[PDB]
Amino acid sequence: ETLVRPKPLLLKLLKSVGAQKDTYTMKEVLFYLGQYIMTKRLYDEKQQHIVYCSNDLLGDLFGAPSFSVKEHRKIYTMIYRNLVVVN
C-alpha cells in the first residue's frame, strides 16, 4: 500500500532475480528481496534467520556484514533508505 521506485543499487538487486519494473509496492520489494536471499543462498543453512552478506551486493545495500530476519526495524529502514516513495 506504498508505491516505491527503488534507487539504482536496490533495483540492481531486484533485477538480479528477474524484476522488470520501475515501480513496486513495498510488499513486492520485500518479496523480491527475500527471493534474492534464497536464490543466492545468503541465509545460514542451520539457523536460517541469519543472513551473511559481507561479500555481496546486499551487504553494500545494508552497510553491514550480516543481519537477522528478526531485525524488522533494520530491514525496513535499509529498504526505505534505498527507494523513493510515490506520494
Partner: peptide
C-alpha cells in the same frame, strides 16, 4: 524453520 518461513512474520 526455513528462511522462507522466517521472511514471509518481514
Amino acid at each position: 524453520t526455513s528462511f522462507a518461513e522466517y521472511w514471509x512474520x518481514x
